[PDB]
Every structure is written in structure tokens, then in C-alpha cells.
Design a protein around this ligand. Structure first.
Ligand SMILES: [Ca+2]
Ligand SMILES: [Ca+2]
Ligand SMILES: [Ca+2]
Ligand SMILES: [Ca+2]
Ligand SMILES: [Ca+2]
Ligand SMILES: [Ca+2]
Ligand SMILES: [Ca+2]
Ligand SMILES: [Ca+2]
Ligand SMILES: [Ca+2]
Ligand SMILES: [Cl-]
Lengths: 154, 154, 153
């Protein structure tokens, strides 16, 4: 009816917001999302401690590739941005050789360590980076680089 | 019934956009918001004149802490972002010692001047910075640093 | 009662539109005409990679086909403090015959800088825009920032 004219504009209005929001989310912010989690590449060079705080400030933590799918998405995300490396949510700060995720959940069978890694170079590497290939590498926590945050859609 | 379905689907859609828009504002853009104002930290080093112009171009002005609540929000904002200092919307450009806000409104009883400030060091300091503590300090206007914009929701 | 609910839904939608407007303009710093949206991507890439990146977001390298579009892009560049960016013009497949990223032919309107295009050393088949807004042909293997254009359709 006559309200449908006003309402009909609203179907278009709501539809328009959906399209533009998609644009902002994808084309502008360049964010990645699965069915349960959202991933965000933050292009600010920080050390591991500051990177984790930044992720927590946004309501998440450093990305935690616990399976093949998550790691692959993160790798593709890295590739398209033309980045060589980012911090991720893996470390062995609390006990050398004993790696855990940022949520303190234990490391498991799945991993993407590059050959020879983790090697704890110079006995000063307790944090983990992901390279464009998707592989993992332990590095010094005082190292400065970009990082990626993970958000649970809960 | 189909009309009830379409309406219910549009309702979920509107709810989804509300949630996604909220995520972008907080997790991605990292903006701070009260009931009347929005605050945006711009991480581009500029001089005071350019900072104000940039804020005006976005439809706002350099932040104006006119009460303790606003100053506290801005201070926490700086802290969480890991910044040491930012330009804010306070100056005494037109008359030495006569400080005004970016909207040309006069300085009042409330202030957060650090001890000894404003001191007009070397008679060359007519702009104002906020440090991580929340305190104010006058500095040279040709100084380059990050800045914070304020937007009126009406 | 139904008209009240409709009006209430209108306020919610208008509010969402307003907040979306704020993010798009005040934060992202995107530029927009009545038909197109422009986005400055600050990642140094070569022309082929820049174009691929633009299509990956659902658009293409900017195509200033009139004075208004070209002026907007220039102001965008000025505001971003950039000296140069890749844009959607080239003569890769045929020398001297420049086309836009949509394969549309070159026309009367242009913003070539004085003396351009010169095809310097026979290795310049792509186009950059400088801060003034002028165009200059350059080598496609050059690496620089670029600007993407999106159709509101
Ligand atoms: Ca160690
Ligand atoms: Ca170690
Ligand atoms: Ca290593
Ligand atoms: Ca003075
Ligand atoms: Ca002074
Ligand atoms: Ca001072
Ligand atoms: Ca050629
Ligand atoms: Ca040529
Ligand atoms: Ca040339
Ligand atoms: Cl370390």
C-alpha cells in the first residue's frame, strides 16, 4: 500500500546499507571472516607484547591457527596485502620449548613450523611469526612487525 | 505469512548491520564515543594548523576536553593506543596567555595543566599537547605529532 | 500503530546510514561522486598487481573520463599527501593507442602533462597521476601506490 512506498524505499535503504557495509568491510578494511571468527590485519609495527595488547584493546587476541583452514586463510590474507610476515598468537615465554597459544590453550598435533623451526636462534626467540607462505617461525619478542588479530563471533 | 517472513528477515538484516557496524567502529576504526560526541585518534604526524584542517575536513575539530570526564576518556584513549602525546584543540594563538578551545570558546575554571604550564617556553609555544597521563602542555605550533579529532553527534 | 512502527524502523535505518556515513568519510577518507566511489590504496605495487588488487575488491584502477572525476582524484591525492599514483590508463597492447582499464577508448578529454605521453625509452605503457592532477606515461614495472574506482551498480 501507500506505506509500501515508504517501506519499499526501506527495502532498498536496508539493501543499500548491506552493500556499502560489505564494501567498507571488504574493499576498505580488508577484513577476513569465517563462520565462527573474524581476522584483521593491523599494519602498525609493534613488539609482541604491544601487539597482543592492541588485539585485546579491540576485543580479541593474536590469531591462533589451530587447524589447516585457519592457517590457509591467514596466509592468503598475508599474501594479498603484500606483507612478508606478521605476529601470531603463539609463544613459549613461560617455558622454553613449550609452545602455547595466546589464550593459554596448549599446542597440539597440528603445526606449520618451517624446516628447522622452532630453533630458538641465539636463545632469544620466544614468539612466533607467520610468513607469506603460511609457515611458522619463532622470533625474538622484541622484534617489531605487523600483526593479525582474531575475534570470536560469540 | 510470506510478508511476515520478509519483515522478519529484514529485521534480522537490520540487526546484523547494527552488529557489524559496531564491530567496525570499535575493533577496526578504534573510535571512542560518548552520548554527545565521537573521538578519533589520527596517527599522522602534522603541525597544529594542518591537524585542525584535517579535523575540519572530516567534519569535526581538534578535541576539546572541557570537563574531567572528557579529559579522562581522551587520556585512556591515548594510553590504550600506546601514545606518549597528541595535539588537542587548545591554543593561545590570537592573544598570549589567553587560551581558547578550537571552537573559539574561552578557557574556563577546569584545566589539566601540568605543573608549571602553560609556560610559553622561549616565548614560542602557542599550541597544546596532551600526554599519556592526561595532563596538558603548551608547545610550539610547528611541532609535528599525532592528533585527536572530536565530532558533535548533532 | 503500524505507521508508528514504520516510522520507528525509519529512524533506526537512518541512524545506521548516518554512522555508516561517518565511517566511510571521516575515518576511511574515501571519495565519492554520484555514480562512483574512489579509494586510495597505500600499498606499493606494479600496474598489473594494482589492477588485480582493485578487481579483487570489486572495482578497477581509477578512470578519469571527465574534468570532475579527475579533479576529485587530484584533491584526494593532495589530501593524502601523495606525489603520484597508478591510474586506469594504458597502451600495452598497441603503442600510442591509450585505453582505460575497462578497455574503453581514449577520447577528447585528457590531462596529459606538457610533453606527455612521450613513451620514454620505449618502455612506458602505463599511466600515473601526479599531485597536480596531470597524467604521465611510465614503465609498467614501476612500483607505486594506486587508486581504485567502484561503480555504484
Ligand atoms: Ca629463549
Ligand atoms: Ca624459545
Ligand atoms: Ca627461528
Ligand atoms: Ca608566544
Ligand atoms: Ca603562548
Ligand atoms: Ca610548555
Ligand atoms: Ca611499449
Ligand atoms: Ca607507450
Ligand atoms: Ca612519460
Ligand atoms: Cl623473545
Amino acid at each position: 500500500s501507500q506505506l509500501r512506498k515508504a517501506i519499499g524505499e526501506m527495502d532498498n535503504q536496508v539493501s543499500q546499507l548491506t552493500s556499502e557495509l560489505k564494501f567498507i568491510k571488504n574493499a576498505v578494511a580488508g577484513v577476513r571472516e569465517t563462520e565462527s571468527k573474524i581476522y584483521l590485519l593491523v599494519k602498525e609495527e609493534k613488539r609482541y607484547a604491544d601487539a597482543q595488547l592492541s588485539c585485546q584493546g579491540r576485543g580479541g587476541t593474536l590469531s591462533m591457527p589451530k587447524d589447516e583452514a585457519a592457517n590457509g586463510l591467514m596466509a592468503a590474507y598475508l599474501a594479498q596485502a603484500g606483507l612478508a610476515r606478521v605476529f601470531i598468537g603463539i609463544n613459549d615465554l613461560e617455558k622454553e620449548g613449550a609452545f602455547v597459544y595466546s589464550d593459554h590453550s596448549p599446542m597440539r598435533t597440528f603445526n606449520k613450523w618451517r624446516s628447522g623451526e622452532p630453533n630458538n636462534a641465539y636463545d632469544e626467540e620466544d614468539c612466533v611469526e607467520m610468513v607469506a607462505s603460511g609457515g611458522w617461525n619463532d622470533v625474538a619478542c622484541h622484534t617489531t612487525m605487523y600483526f593479525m588479530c582474531e575475534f570470536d563471533k560469540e
